[PDB]
Design a protein around this motif. Sequence first.
Motif, mmCIF file in Angstrom:
data_model
loop_
_atom_site.group_PDB
_atom_site.id
_atom_site.type_symbol
_atom_site.label_atom_id
_atom_site.label_comp_id
_atom_site.label_asym_id
_atom_site.label_seq_id
_atom_site.Cartn_x
_atom_site.Cartn_y
_atom_site.Cartn_z
ATOM 1 N N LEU A 174 2.300 1.862 7.218
ATOM 2 C CA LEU A 174 2.274 1.221 8.517
ATOM 3 C C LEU A 174 3.596 0.542 8.816
ATOM 4 O O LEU A 174 4.229 -0.031 7.932
ATOM 5 C CB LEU A 174 1.154 0.204 8.591
ATOM 6 C CG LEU A 174 -0.240 0.786 8.458
ATOM 7 C CD1 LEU A 174 -1.190 -0.230 8.956
ATOM 8 C CD2 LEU A 174 -0.401 2.046 9.265
ATOM 9 N N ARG A 175 3.999 0.608 10.079
ATOM 10 C CA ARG A 175 5.027 -0.274 10.609
ATOM 11 C C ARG A 175 4.358 -1.476 11.248
ATOM 12 O O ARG A 175 3.841 -1.393 12.361
ATOM 13 C CB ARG A 175 5.914 0.442 11.618
ATOM 14 C CG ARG A 175 7.146 -0.356 11.982
ATOM 15 C CD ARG A 175 7.787 0.103 13.274
ATOM 16 N NE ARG A 175 8.306 1.461 13.184
ATOM 17 C CZ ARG A 175 8.142 2.382 14.127
ATOM 18 N NH1 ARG A 175 7.482 2.088 15.236
ATOM 19 N NH2 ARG A 175 8.643 3.600 13.968
ATOM 20 N N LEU A 176 4.402 -2.584 10.557
ATOM 21 C CA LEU A 176 3.748 -3.809 10.945
ATOM 22 C C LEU A 176 4.553 -4.498 12.048
ATOM 23 O O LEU A 176 5.677 -4.088 12.336
ATOM 24 C CB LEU A 176 3.597 -4.660 9.691
ATOM 25 C CG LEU A 176 2.581 -3.999 8.774
ATOM 26 C CD1 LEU A 176 2.502 -4.690 7.452
ATOM 27 C CD2 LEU A 176 1.246 -4.018 9.441
ATOM 28 N N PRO A 177 3.990 -5.506 12.730
ATOM 29 C CA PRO A 177 4.728 -6.103 13.849
ATOM 30 C C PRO A 177 5.946 -6.887 13.452
ATOM 31 O O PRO A 177 6.839 -7.088 14.278
ATOM 32 C CB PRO A 177 3.690 -7.017 14.488
ATOM 33 C CG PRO A 177 2.442 -6.429 14.156
ATOM 34 C CD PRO A 177 2.578 -5.915 12.794
ATOM 35 N N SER A 178 6.022 -7.334 12.213
ATOM 36 C CA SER A 178 7.303 -7.730 11.665
ATOM 37 C C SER A 178 8.293 -6.589 11.589
ATOM 38 O O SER A 178 9.499 -6.836 11.650
ATOM 39 C CB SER A 178 7.111 -8.284 10.275
ATOM 40 O OG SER A 178 6.721 -7.231 9.432
ATOM 41 N N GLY A 179 7.823 -5.361 11.437
ATOM 42 C CA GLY A 179 8.647 -4.293 10.934
ATOM 43 C C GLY A 179 8.728 -4.204 9.433
ATOM 44 O O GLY A 179 9.587 -3.483 8.919
ATOM 45 N N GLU A 180 7.874 -4.915 8.711
ATOM 46 C CA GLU A 180 7.566 -4.504 7.356
ATOM 47 C C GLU A 180 6.963 -3.115 7.378
ATOM 48 O O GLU A 180 6.041 -2.837 8.144
ATOM 49 C CB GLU A 180 6.602 -5.493 6.705
ATOM 50 C CG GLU A 180 6.400 -5.298 5.219
ATOM 51 C CD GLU A 180 5.812 -6.517 4.540
ATOM 52 O OE1 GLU A 180 6.342 -7.623 4.730
ATOM 53 O OE2 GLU A 180 4.837 -6.361 3.790
ATOM 54 N N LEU A 181 7.506 -2.232 6.554
ATOM 55 C CA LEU A 181 6.822 -1.010 6.172
ATOM 56 C C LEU A 181 6.022 -1.248 4.910
ATOM 57 O O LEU A 181 6.585 -1.595 3.867
ATOM 58 C CB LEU A 181 7.798 0.132 5.949
ATOM 59 C CG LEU A 181 8.509 0.602 7.201
ATOM 60 C CD1 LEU A 181 9.472 1.702 6.853
ATOM 61 C CD2 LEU A 181 7.494 1.085 8.180
ATOM 62 N N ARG A 182 4.717 -1.055 5.004
ATOM 63 C CA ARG A 182 3.836 -1.433 3.921
ATOM 64 C C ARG A 182 2.763 -0.379 3.787
ATOM 65 O O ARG A 182 2.163 0.039 4.778
ATOM 66 C CB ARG A 182 3.214 -2.797 4.168
ATOM 67 C CG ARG A 182 2.398 -3.306 3.023
ATOM 68 C CD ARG A 182 1.489 -4.401 3.489
ATOM 69 N NE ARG A 182 1.423 -5.480 2.525
ATOM 70 C CZ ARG A 182 0.478 -5.583 1.610
ATOM 71 N NH1 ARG A 182 -0.468 -4.668 1.547
ATOM 72 N NH2 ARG A 182 0.482 -6.593 0.762
ATOM 73 N N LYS A 183 2.549 0.059 2.558
ATOM 74 C CA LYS A 183 1.418 0.906 2.243
ATOM 75 C C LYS A 183 0.133 0.129 2.440
ATOM 76 O O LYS A 183 -0.044 -0.947 1.866
ATOM 77 C CB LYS A 183 1.508 1.400 0.805
ATOM 78 C CG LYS A 183 2.640 2.364 0.512
ATOM 79 C CD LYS A 183 2.554 2.790 -0.936
ATOM 80 C CE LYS A 183 3.691 3.674 -1.351
ATOM 81 N NZ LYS A 183 3.571 3.988 -2.799
ATOM 82 N N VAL A 184 -0.766 0.675 3.239
ATOM 83 C CA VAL A 184 -2.160 0.271 3.244
ATOM 84 C C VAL A 184 -2.959 1.394 2.607
ATOM 85 O O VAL A 184 -2.581 2.563 2.712
ATOM 86 C CB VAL A 184 -2.626 -0.031 4.680
ATOM 87 C CG1 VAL A 184 -4.025 -0.594 4.715
ATOM 88 C CG2 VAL A 184 -1.663 -0.987 5.328
ATOM 89 N N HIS A 185 -4.009 1.035 1.876
ATOM 90 C CA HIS A 185 -5.025 1.994 1.476
ATOM 91 C C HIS A 185 -5.611 2.701 2.684
ATOM 92 O O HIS A 185 -5.710 2.128 3.767
ATOM 93 C CB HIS A 185 -6.124 1.276 0.708
ATOM 94 C CG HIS A 185 -6.985 2.178 -0.108
ATOM 95 N ND1 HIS A 185 -7.932 3.003 0.447
ATOM 96 C CD2 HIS A 185 -7.052 2.374 -1.442
ATOM 97 C CE1 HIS A 185 -8.542 3.676 -0.508
ATOM 98 N NE2 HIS A 185 -8.026 3.313 -1.667
ATOM 99 N N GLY A 186 -5.984 3.963 2.498
ATOM 100 C CA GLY A 186 -6.457 4.750 3.619
ATOM 101 C C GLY A 186 -7.825 4.330 4.106
ATOM 102 O O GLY A 186 -8.120 4.425 5.298
ATOM 103 N N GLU A 187 -8.666 3.846 3.206
ATOM 104 C CA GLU A 187 -10.060 3.602 3.530
ATOM 105 C C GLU A 187 -10.239 2.312 4.319
ATOM 106 O O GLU A 187 -11.313 2.089 4.886
ATOM 107 C CB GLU A 187 -10.882 3.557 2.236
ATOM 108 C CG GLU A 187 -12.395 3.735 2.399
ATOM 109 C CD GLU A 187 -13.180 3.424 1.137
ATOM 110 O OE1 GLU A 187 -12.570 2.973 0.150
ATOM 111 O OE2 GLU A 187 -14.411 3.622 1.133
ATOM 112 N N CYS A 188 -9.218 1.467 4.365
ATOM 113 C CA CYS A 188 -9.217 0.311 5.247
ATOM 114 C C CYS A 188 -9.338 0.744 6.695
ATOM 115 O O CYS A 188 -8.579 1.594 7.161
ATOM 116 C CB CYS A 188 -7.932 -0.485 5.060
ATOM 117 S SG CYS A 188 -7.549 -0.867 3.359
#
Lengths: 275, 48
Positions: A174-188
Amino acid sequence: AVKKFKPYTPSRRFMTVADFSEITKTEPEKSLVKPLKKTGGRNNQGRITVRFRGGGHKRLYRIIDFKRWDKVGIPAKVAAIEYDPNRSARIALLHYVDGEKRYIIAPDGLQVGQQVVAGPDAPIQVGNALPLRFIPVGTVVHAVELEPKKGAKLARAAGTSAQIQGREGDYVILRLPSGELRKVHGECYATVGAVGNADHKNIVLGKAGRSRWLGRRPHVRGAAMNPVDHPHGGGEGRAPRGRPPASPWGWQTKGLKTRKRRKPSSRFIIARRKK
Amino acid sequence: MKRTWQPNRRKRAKTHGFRARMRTPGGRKVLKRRRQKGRWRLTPAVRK
RNA sequence: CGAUGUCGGCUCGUCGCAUCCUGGGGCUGAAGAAGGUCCCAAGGGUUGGGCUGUUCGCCCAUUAAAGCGGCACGCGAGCUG
RNA sequence: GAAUGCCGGCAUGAGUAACGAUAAAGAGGGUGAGAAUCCCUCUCGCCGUAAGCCCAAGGGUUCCUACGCAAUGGUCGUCAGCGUAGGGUUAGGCGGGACCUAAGGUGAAGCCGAAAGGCGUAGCCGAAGGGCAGCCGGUUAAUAUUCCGGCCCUUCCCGCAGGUGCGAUGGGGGGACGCUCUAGGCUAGGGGGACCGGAGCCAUGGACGAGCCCGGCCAGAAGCGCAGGGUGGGAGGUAGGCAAAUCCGCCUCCCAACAAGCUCUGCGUGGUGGGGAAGCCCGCGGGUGACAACCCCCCGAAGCCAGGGAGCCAAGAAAAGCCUCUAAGCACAACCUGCGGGAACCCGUACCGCAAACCGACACAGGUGGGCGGGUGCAAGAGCACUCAGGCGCGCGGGAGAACCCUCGCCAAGGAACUCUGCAAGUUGGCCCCGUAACUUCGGGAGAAGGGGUGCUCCCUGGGGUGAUGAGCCCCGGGGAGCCGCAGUGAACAGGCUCUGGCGACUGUUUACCAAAAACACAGCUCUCUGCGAACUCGUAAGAGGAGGUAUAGGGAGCGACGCUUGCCCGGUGCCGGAAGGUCAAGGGGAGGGGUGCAAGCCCCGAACCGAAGCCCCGGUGAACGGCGGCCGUAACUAUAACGGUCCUAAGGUAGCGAAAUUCCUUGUCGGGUAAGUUCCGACCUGCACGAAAAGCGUAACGACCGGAGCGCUGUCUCGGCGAGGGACCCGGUGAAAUUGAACUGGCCGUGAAGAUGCGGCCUACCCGUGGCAGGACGAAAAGACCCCGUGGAGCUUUACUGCAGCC
RNA sequence: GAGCUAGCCCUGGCCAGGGUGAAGCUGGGGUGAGACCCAGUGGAGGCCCGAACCGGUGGGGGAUGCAAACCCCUCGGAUGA
RNA sequence: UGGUUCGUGGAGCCAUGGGGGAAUCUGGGCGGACCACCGCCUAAGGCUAAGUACUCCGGGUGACCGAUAGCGCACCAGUAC
RNA sequence: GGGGGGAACCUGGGGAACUGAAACAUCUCAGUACCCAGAGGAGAGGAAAGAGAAAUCGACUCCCUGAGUAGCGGCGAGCGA
RNA sequence: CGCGGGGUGGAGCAGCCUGGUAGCUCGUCGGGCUCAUAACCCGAAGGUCGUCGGUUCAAAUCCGGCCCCCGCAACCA
RNA sequence: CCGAGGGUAGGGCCCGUGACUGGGGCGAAGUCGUAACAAGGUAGCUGUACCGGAAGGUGCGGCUGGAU
RNA sequence: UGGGAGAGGGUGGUGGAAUUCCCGGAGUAGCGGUGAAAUGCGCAGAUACCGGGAGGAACGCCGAUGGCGAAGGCAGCCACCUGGUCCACCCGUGACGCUGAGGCGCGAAAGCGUGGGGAGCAAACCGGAUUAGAUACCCGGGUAGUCCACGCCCUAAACG
Ligand SMILES: [Mg+2]
Ligand SMILES: [Mg+2]
Ligand SMILES: [Mg+2]
Ligand SMILES: [Mg+2]
Ligand SMILES: [Mg+2]
Ligand SMILES: [Mg+2]
Ligand SMILES: [Mg+2]
Ligand SMILES: [Mg+2]
Ligand SMILES: [Mg+2]
Ligand SMILES: [Mg+2]
Ligand SMILES: [Mg+2]
Ligand SMILES: [Mg+2]
Ligand SMILES: [Mg+2]
Ligand SMILES: [Mg+2]
Ligand SMILES: [Mg+2]
Ligand SMILES: [Mg+2]
Ligand SMILES: [Mg+2]
Ligand SMILES: [Mg+2]
Ligand SMILES: [Mg+2]
Ligand SMILES: [Mg+2]
Ligand SMILES: [Mg+2]
Ligand SMILES: [Mg+2]
Ligand SMILES: [Mg+2]
Ligand SMILES: [Mg+2]
Ligand SMILES: [Mg+2]
Ligand SMILES: [Mg+2]
Ligand SMILES: [Mg+2]
Ligand SMILES: [Mg+2]
Ligand SMILES: [Mg+2]
Ligand SMILES: [Mg+2]
Ligand SMILES: [Mg+2]
Ligand SMILES: [Mg+2]
Ligand SMILES: [Mg+2]
Ligand SMILES: [Mg+2]
Ligand SMILES: [Mg+2]
Ligand SMILES: [Mg+2]
Ligand SMILES: [Mg+2]
Ligand SMILES: [Mg+2]
Ligand SMILES: [Mg+2]
Ligand SMILES: [Mg+2]
Ligand SMILES: [Mg+2]
Ligand SMILES: [Mg+2]
Ligand SMILES: [Mg+2]
Ligand SMILES: [Mg+2]
Ligand SMILES: [Mg+2]
Ligand SMILES: [Mg+2]
Ligand SMILES: [Mg+2]
Ligand SMILES: [Mg+2]
Ligand SMILES: [Mg+2]
Ligand SMILES: [Mg+2]
Ligand SMILES: [Mg+2]
Ligand SMILES: [Mg+2]
Ligand SMILES: [Mg+2]
Ligand SMILES: [Mg+2]
Ligand SMILES: [Mg+2]
Ligand SMILES: [Mg+2]
Ligand SMILES: [Mg+2]
Ligand SMILES: [Mg+2]
Ligand SMILES: [Mg+2]
Ligand SMILES: [Mg+2]
Ligand SMILES: [Mg+2]
Ligand SMILES: [Mg+2]
Ligand SMILES: [Mg+2]
Ligand SMILES: [Mg+2]
Ligand SMILES: [Mg+2]
Ligand SMILES: [Mg+2]
Ligand SMILES: [Mg+2]
Ligand SMILES: [Mg+2]
Ligand SMILES: [Mg+2]
Ligand SMILES: [Mg+2]
Ligand SMILES: [Mg+2]
Ligand SMILES: [Mg+2]
Ligand SMILES: [Mg+2]
Ligand SMILES: [Mg+2]
Ligand SMILES: [Mg+2]
Ligand SMILES: [Mg+2]
Ligand SMILES: [Mg+2]
Ligand SMILES: [Mg+2]
Ligand SMILES: [Mg+2]
Ligand SMILES: [Mg+2]
Ligand SMILES: [Mg+2]
Ligand SMILES: [Mg+2]
Ligand SMILES: [Mg+2]
Ligand SMILES: [Mg+2]
Ligand SMILES: [Mg+2]
Ligand SMILES: [Mg+2]
Ligand SMILES: [Mg+2]
Ligand SMILES: [Mg+2]
Ligand SMILES: [Mg+2]
Ligand SMILES: [Mg+2]
Ligand SMILES: [Mg+2]
Ligand SMILES: [Mg+2]
Ligand SMILES: [Mg+2]
Ligand SMILES: [Mg+2]
Ligand SMILES: [Mg+2]
Ligand SMILES: [Mg+2]
Ligand SMILES: [Mg+2]
Ligand SMILES: [Mg+2]
Ligand SMILES: [Mg+2]
Ligand SMILES: [Mg+2]
Ligand SMILES: [Mg+2]
Ligand SMILES: [Mg+2]
Ligand SMILES: [Mg+2]
Ligand SMILES: [Mg+2]
Ligand SMILES: [Mg+2]
Ligand SMILES: [Mg+2]
Ligand SMILES: [Mg+2]
Ligand SMILES: [Mg+2]
Ligand SMILES: [Mg+2]
Ligand SMILES: [Mg+2]
Ligand SMILES: [Mg+2]
Ligand SMILES: [Mg+2]
Ligand SMILES: [Mg+2]
Ligand SMILES: [Mg+2]
Ligand SMILES: [Mg+2]
Ligand SMILES: [Mg+2]
Ligand SMILES: [Mg+2]
Ligand SMILES: [Mg+2]
Ligand SMILES: [Mg+2]
Ligand SMILES: [Mg+2]
Ligand SMILES: [Mg+2]
Ligand SMILES: [Mg+2]
Ligand SMILES: [Mg+2]
Ligand SMILES: [Mg+2]
Ligand SMILES: [Mg+2]
Ligand SMILES: [Mg+2]
Ligand SMILES: [Mg+2]
Ligand SMILES: [Mg+2]
Ligand SMILES: [Mg+2]
Ligand SMILES: [Mg+2]
Ligand SMILES: [Mg+2]
Ligand SMILES: [Mg+2]
Ligand SMILES: [Mg+2]
Ligand SMILES: [Mg+2]
Ligand SMILES: [Mg+2]
Ligand SMILES: [Mg+2]
Ligand SMILES: [Mg+2]
Ligand SMILES: [Mg+2]
Ligand SMILES: [Mg+2]
Ligand SMILES: [Mg+2]
Ligand SMILES: [Mg+2]
Ligand SMILES: [Mg+2]
Ligand SMILES: [Mg+2]
Ligand SMILES: [Mg+2]
Ligand SMILES: [Mg+2]
Ligand SMILES: [Mg+2]
Ligand SMILES: [Mg+2]
Ligand SMILES: [Mg+2]
Ligand SMILES: [Mg+2]
Ligand SMILES: [Mg+2]
Ligand SMILES: [Mg+2]
Ligand SMILES: [Mg+2]
Ligand SMILES: [Mg+2]
Ligand SMILES: [Mg+2]
Ligand SMILES: [Mg+2]
Ligand SMILES: [Mg+2]
Ligand SMILES: [Mg+2]
Ligand SMILES: [Mg+2]
Ligand SMILES: [Mg+2]
Ligand SMILES: [Mg+2]
Ligand SMILES: [Mg+2]
Ligand SMILES: [Mg+2]
Ligand SMILES: [Mg+2]
């Protein structure tokens, strides 16, 4: 889309309120509110723990579905769009077809009368809720769970947005609103479209008084103090800071990172925030 | 002008009173000291 | 130093004379008027303002002249700050 | 014999200051040993949104009566809130409890903590919130919504009759809620009445009059009307409301709707029960009036119907009682309706209550939440003047009528000359009308400034409400003629104004008790931290806050609306980035060396190498800590220098400001204003030592902030004068305190530890008071706060030393 | 020891009367449709005058006071932080 | 790390928060780092009066005080305030 | 069976600082003051895995000596078997 | 009145601290390049190191006194 | 009542004047560097913005009135 | 009425080459740059190569003296909405025509306001060269801006 004022007092020269075009319903649903215990900073010890909060308008807390996987496949009617104090967003009342009623938060472009539904089988149209691996790359999404079945943590504020930049394995980027790129688990699960009320940032509060109405007390600068209270304080004259500028309690406030170095969440972040 | 004693039968009996004192090892010592002392009135006379 | 309350101003005086005016006198490069200097003399007099906390001072308009000083830089158990 | 010594007692001051509001007192009678002070009566004054009444806190016999005055009473006292004794507080309905929950507290589970203890879901406690059935009159010396009279009502138990799937600590509905404005109809409360009731009066010129004065209501079940609120009705399906559901919710069909029906509340009439003045006849109450009258009109709420409507963002408690739904259980029970009979517990109930009963040591000019708080003219009003009911004249008086003080009034002629400054004190002052500048954010400035009217009589005319279209009453106007005075907001409550400069934008906040400001805060701008078990904070922990929020969000920091803007330096500090390298601890490793024993063996040091943070090292980073230059020469008058030369730096102050809140020399120089201007304003720039987020330069409006100037008007002044009352003085009563080595306490000139009433020598000088003035007694008060001293003490800082939390 | 003071949490109450006249709605105007203008309505505001209430600006009294922070004339806020 | 006099000192003994971690009389600890000899003693379970301390109580005795002394109180005291 | 008191005396679990060092940080005040828990008329300790050098004592406690000795100390002050 | 830096060719600096030796740039001077000037190239001169005084084998150097010239502090009253 | 004019108060236009300041025109030969005229030694001109001691430089865009 | 080609405008999507950045592989001593050098970058493993991902701006050949519009101006492809212009037929109206002071609308690029986006390029700025001096022409970094949405500014060698 913001409502201005003629300057008939000096505070109404600048002061803006949100339009409330898109509200539909003016008192909230009785089975689903429960009272916000106000704190004013005060913990169970009764000391202030963060400062300068207090004196708010009184409020009622609206229970929100931050899960939506309660009710998988069971579609629902958008009853209404309401004010909520406790959020930057507005809120949507869901008339489900078994007649449980629930609040969710209110994505942009959503209109009254149309139909939302949650699950892996859900169509990609605004406000439906899906686990992340069943959502296409590139889309804009909100209300995003972070670990699965722990309920939605990410992109809940007004106007906010996460972009799926793609997948890796079980995990999805995900590109978060900070602009952190962060792996989220898919099942979330997450919840498609971006959040309404996007001119929340364009409020000008006008004056002292609205912050007191929002419960935010005067914030008093550390060079206005005397040095028992604060590092900066005192000095005959005004003072420049004389020292690396700093908290009350000692630590600096131009540039000191304090994310924990040994956090196990560090193995899931690609990129720090920017700007 | 508004001086310091603004008396209150409830607040007195809730603060200095008996079932304050035996709650707390402060106050359990206090009545221990006064009963050691000789004293007639352990708690303040509050007037219900 | 178990206190000797400090500048200036207001009010109240009083004293010394190395004299600002007024009285008398000498010399004058004193014609007269008006001036300069020196001697005797403290009886009494020695204005109102502008500026600034002002002492002092600069200037305005007059005067015969708009004096120097002491009295805990007179005077807060009289006043002001 | 001293220690500003410790306790006790008595002096001095001193018959002095004061006697605790400048709201005010006089007389006659009575009681008494005794009266300005107690009782009564008349005259007089004061509050009258209170200084009058009802509560709530708090006080805990002070309430009422009889007997008293030694003390408390700032005097007296027969009096009292004082002594002695006795009486005195009545509740199913008022308030609390046997009902509910909020903050919070306690807290079986369970978590944490050397101990003590700390959190903590359920539950309980927790009220001036929710729920809940009593109104009017009388009586007592004192209590009454409590006892009595009238008229109403609630729960529980029992007994009957009928109706129904009854049943809760469970599900659902409801209770259930903000701010501002506001509609309709009521009532409270008030005003008028030529109508009704009545004891009375013609006073001094007039008045027997539609004359005067007084009064003309309260409560009230059922029913009824008026004004409202609340409220859709049937069928079917149905996975949701953690079991069930006929209830709720969702979907479908049908029915009528500014409705209607059902229900609830307010108001009125309502069988009836009560009250009933002025006066004057007795004595702090009672009889009559009278058999009382108990009508109409006008004003009218903030209160009621109420959960009403409309708008707005800051989005406006929980649980129970109440209705319904079913499970176990029972379905001889159990509930629902109507009546009848019984049962109905504990606490408070006196009294002060903006005060002499509470908090201020006091019978103290202070502080204390809620309700009523009448009338009349003032535009309105809880404001101000005077008053109604009601309550007081403040617990020392009488006299005189000095200086001087407080508080008030007035003034010639001048009008700020006084003065640190118009400090203070004056003028203006309300309403209506005309009219109102630069500037600017278009709102403002602005009530800018500056004037004109304001009383009374008569006449004519318009609109609105109530009505009935009317009368009458009420409100709101317009026009014309006339009358009086110096004056018509005729007394009382009401801005002096302008120009221009500095600072902060603004409204706010602050050193309770010397500083209200330029200081703080503020919306706004920026930098930085923070991906949720967030960063941060409090706690050893648990756990909380953060936040039941999620980067348009949360913490920290600094400027501080807004317009225009915010340049250069990474050399050092800081922070951020960098797997190489160097330095680096425990540990790994064990080359060798040592000790001992006859021996295996035991034990001890121990080098190369491996080896993390941190530092060194390489970069970035100014809305991070910070810093932003010398010297010399040069232009066809002199003068200056747009040039050039050279040294250092990491880099040499850009715009914009500038003798400024900063300018030492300095009252810099020039100009304006003034007759004169160390101030103020406009400029110059030689900035000791402005300058760009400790922000820079401006900026309309705002400010009890600070300078400057002017108009207006004045006792601020040359320059004082008079008057007023409260002290002061005199008399009667009561009567302190700081201080005090003792005193029989003069000056000049010397003198002495220096500045002598006391020593010396002269001079003056009968003993003793009172009102005053303040030069001295180095007067009092406080063991100097400025200074120093002590290897005293305490906050604060830091690249002082050492350590600790914390973090790596 | 938070019965004073400071801050917050829970719950009720209080703020007479007058003045200016924002948004919005309705009508008229306007253009092709809008903007926008005018009139009436409308009553917003850390708005204005101004009592209760909350303060404590300047000046005078008070100084062993009425008072260990008072009183008087004067002044700021008074629908909001 | 603490206790012992033992402040790291040549630092042993006793207690032990962390890590490693056996054996049963041919078996363990100690005799002040360690090795040898020669000796002492038997850990990792508990119980046990007498002698010792104190004196709210009762009695006895003072080269103890005698109402400002003696307990703060000789008296209606831990009261009035 | 426990809870809760008891003037001290006792044991355990925590545990300062003024002060001495003529400053002060190791030291000292001192495991004192206090806080907490818990015994009982006593508590604690108690039959050697001990002492220490005679092939010696023979559980613990308490007094006197040992002894201000051995020693411990910024070898300072002082501590002290 | 106090404290501490500087004076060296015509200008700006360097050389000292452990003594000897006066270096850099610009300027100036002579020649070259150009039609000619400046720039550019070759070469050159120019120094009581502010002063009086020693010290020492010897002083720009080291130490006092004076002369300019620079800046700094002058506080609690 | 009207009323010449006087007085008070606030506005509008216009003229002179004002320490100082911004720029211009002019003035035979002073100082500093050379942007335009050639491809002017970097094509030029231009609108706008930023910078600079001066012409002017660069950015962005346009024109050829720019040659080769 | 029928038919016609066009970068005409606006909205929304989409494809591909290349630059830069990140991840991994493999590989060594210089890359880059100029008139020539230097700053810089590089052993901490650069350049060049390969693969993968993210990111934005502009659409090579077709393509020209061409096309479209009143002007500014418009160029990948897809759609939807939409405007001007042209031809034939000679059907219908019947002079409704022209210009246009004002007015109203558009109006390149740079600039401004709130919020995005920022790969390259690039005033100001810093360095290195050049020069007597070089705030410039050359080179290396490099902020606004260039892009999107809305609202302003309304100038030009807006020219033919
Ligand atoms: Mg609720
Ligand atoms: Mg709590
Ligand atoms: Mg607590
Ligand atoms: Mg919302
Ligand atoms: Mg301060
Ligand atoms: Mg503190
Ligand atoms: Mg603190
Ligand atoms: Mg600090
Ligand atoms: Mg500081
Ligand atoms: Mg201070
Ligand atoms: Mg300063
Ligand atoms: Mg007793
Ligand atoms: Mg007793
Ligand atoms: Mg003395
Ligand atoms: Mg003489
Ligand atoms: Mg003479
Ligand atoms: Mg003469
Ligand atoms: Mg003569
Ligand atoms: Mg003097
Ligand atoms: Mg003198
Ligand atoms: Mg003097
Ligand atoms: Mg004085
Ligand atoms: Mg004196
Ligand atoms: Mg004196
Ligand atoms: Mg002063
Ligand atoms: Mg004394
Ligand atoms: Mg006397
Ligand atoms: Mg007297
Ligand atoms: Mg007297
Ligand atoms: Mg009196
Ligand atoms: Mg008698
Ligand atoms: Mg009266
Ligand atoms: Mg009392
Ligand atoms: Mg009594
Ligand atoms: Mg009585
Ligand atoms: Mg008496
Ligand atoms: Mg008696
Ligand atoms: Mg008496
Ligand atoms: Mg009598
Ligand atoms: Mg009595
Ligand atoms: Mg019962
Ligand atoms: Mg608890
Ligand atoms: Mg309960
Ligand atoms: Mg209650
Ligand atoms: Mg209640
Ligand atoms: Mg009740
Ligand atoms: Mg008559
Ligand atoms: Mg009447
Ligand atoms: Mg009735
Ligand atoms: Mg169910
Ligand atoms: Mg009725
Ligand atoms: Mg009667
Ligand atoms: Mg309502
Ligand atoms: Mg409950
Ligand atoms: Mg039922
Ligand atoms: Mg009955
Ligand atoms: Mg009662
Ligand atoms: Mg009563
Ligand atoms: Mg009251
Ligand atoms: Mg009293
Ligand atoms: Mg009295
Ligand atoms: Mg009183
Ligand atoms: Mg108060
Ligand atoms: Mg009050
Ligand atoms: Mg009234
Ligand atoms: Mg009148
Ligand atoms: Mg009044
Ligand atoms: Mg009195
Ligand atoms: Mg006069
Ligand atoms: Mg006169
Ligand atoms: Mg005058
Ligand atoms: Mg004067
Ligand atoms: Mg005044
Ligand atoms: Mg006026
Ligand atoms: Mg009259
Ligand atoms: Mg009416
Ligand atoms: Mg007035
Ligand atoms: Mg000034
Ligand atoms: Mg301010
Ligand atoms: Mg104060
Ligand atoms: Mg203070
Ligand atoms: Mg103020
Ligand atoms: Mg003050
Ligand atoms: Mg700003
Ligand atoms: Mg939490
Ligand atoms: Mg929360
Ligand atoms: Mg500031
Ligand atoms: Mg502006
Ligand atoms: Mg730096
Ligand atoms: Mg740096
Ligand atoms: Mg560096
Ligand atoms: Mg290597
Ligand atoms: Mg090692
Ligand atoms: Mg390392
Ligand atoms: Mg800066
Ligand atoms: Mg510069
Ligand atoms: Mg200047
Ligand atoms: Mg300066
Ligand atoms: Mg700054
Ligand atoms: Mg500022
Ligand atoms: Mg300024
Ligand atoms: Mg200003
Ligand atoms: Mg002010
Ligand atoms: Mg203010
Ligand atoms: Mg008198
Ligand atoms: Mg004598
Ligand atoms: Mg004598
Ligand atoms: Mg003598
Ligand atoms: Mg006398
Ligand atoms: Mg005297
Ligand atoms: Mg006197
Ligand atoms: Mg004295
Ligand atoms: Mg002393
Ligand atoms: Mg002091
Ligand atoms: Mg010393
Ligand atoms: Mg010392
Ligand atoms: Mg010291
Ligand atoms: Mg409080
Ligand atoms: Mg309080
Ligand atoms: Mg209003
Ligand atoms: Mg206001
Ligand atoms: Mg006001
Ligand atoms: Mg006001
Ligand atoms: Mg009231
Ligand atoms: Mg205050
Ligand atoms: Mg005052
Ligand atoms: Mg005074
Ligand atoms: Mg006021
Ligand atoms: Mg040890
Ligand atoms: Mg262990
Ligand atoms: Mg052992
Ligand atoms: Mg051993
Ligand atoms: Mg042994
Ligand atoms: Mg005796
Ligand atoms: Mg005694
Ligand atoms: Mg016990
Ligand atoms: Mg202990
Ligand atoms: Mg010491
Ligand atoms: Mg010790
Ligand atoms: Mg035992
Ligand atoms: Mg044995
Ligand atoms: Mg010791
Ligand atoms: Mg010891
Ligand atoms: Mg001082
Ligand atoms: Mg001082
Ligand atoms: Mg000092
Ligand atoms: Mg006329
Ligand atoms: Mg005229
Ligand atoms: Mg040229
Ligand atoms: Mg060129
Ligand atoms: Mg440039
Ligand atoms: Mg063009
Ligand atoms: Mg082409
Ligand atoms: Mg035809
Ligand atoms: Mg553009
Ligand atoms: Mg700009
Ligand atoms: Mg580039
Ligand atoms: Mg450069
Ligand atoms: Mg140069
Ligand atoms: Mg870049
Ligand atoms: Mg810009
Ligand atoms: Mg910008
Ligand atoms: Mg344009």
